[PDB]
């Protein structure tokens, strides 16, 4: 281990990310972004974050009965806003802009009063 | 499939842009209509 | 996959909205010309 308690649960198909730090004691305090963020009780040991599609980030920390531990700064890039502009997307956007602008301009032209 | 997501999120923003164009055109023409009447 | 099918519904809604608003604009422009 070498004084690195915080880990991340792996081997999961559910769209959620969790944490895990091992401290054989009671009242194993938790942390997030250095500042105090919570606590821990019996019957559960894993702090939860939610879906990975929201891209969790920031430094995370845990502490048992020992001194200040070291973080597990997590980075995710589940994009989910992923426009691919290679050969058939920039052209489509350009055409949809041009023809819409033209059809708007014709209508504005045909207003004389 | 990833390709479906790419195409879908490509079309969503384009249709949002077209909707914004339609809204601004409606604002212009309703201003003209209020001026006329 | 529960979010890929959500954008595939928002796109349907936006296309529906655009089809309604283009008719709105066409009708109001036809009125304004008269």
């Amino acid at each position: 281990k070498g004084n690195h308690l915080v880990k991340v649960y792996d081997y999961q198909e559910d769209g959620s990310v969790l944490l895990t730090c091992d401290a054989e004691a009671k009242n194993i305090t938790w942390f997030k972004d250095g500042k105090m963020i919570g606590f821990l009780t019996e019957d559960k040991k894993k702090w939860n974050l939610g879906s990975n599609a929201k891209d969790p980030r920031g430094m995370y920390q845990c502490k048992g009965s020992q001194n200040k531990s070291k973080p597990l700064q997590v980075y995710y890039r589940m994009c989910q806003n992923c426009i691919e502009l290679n050969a058939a997307t920039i052209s489509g956007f350009l055409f949809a802009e041009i023809v819409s602008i033209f059809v708007l301009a014709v209508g504005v032209y045909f207003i004389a009063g | 499939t990833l390709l479906l997501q790419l195409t879908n999120t490509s079309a969503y923003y384009m249709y949002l842009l077209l909707l914004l164009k339609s809204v601004v055109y409606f604002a212009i023409i309703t201003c003209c209509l209020l001026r006329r009447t | 996959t529960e979010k890929v099918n959500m954008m595939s519904l928002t796109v349907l809604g936006l296309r529906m909205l655009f089809a309604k608003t283009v008719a709105v604009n066409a009708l109001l422009t036809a009125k304004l010309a008269a």
């Binding site: 058939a88 489509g92 055409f95 949809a96 023809v99 059809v103 | 390709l3 479906l4 790419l6 195409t7 079309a11 | 296309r15 283009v22 066409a26 036809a30 008269a34």
Partner: peptide
């Protein structure tokens, strides 16, 4: 084989609809 054929077909259909509407509203005015 149809990721974007959807919107490619839709784009042409909108254009044809708008064009045919333009001619129709003309005749209605007479």
């Amino acid at each position: 084989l149809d990721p974007k054929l959807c919107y490619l077909l839709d784009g042409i259909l909108f254009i044809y609809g708008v064009i045919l509407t333009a001619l129709f509203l003309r005749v209605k005015f007479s």
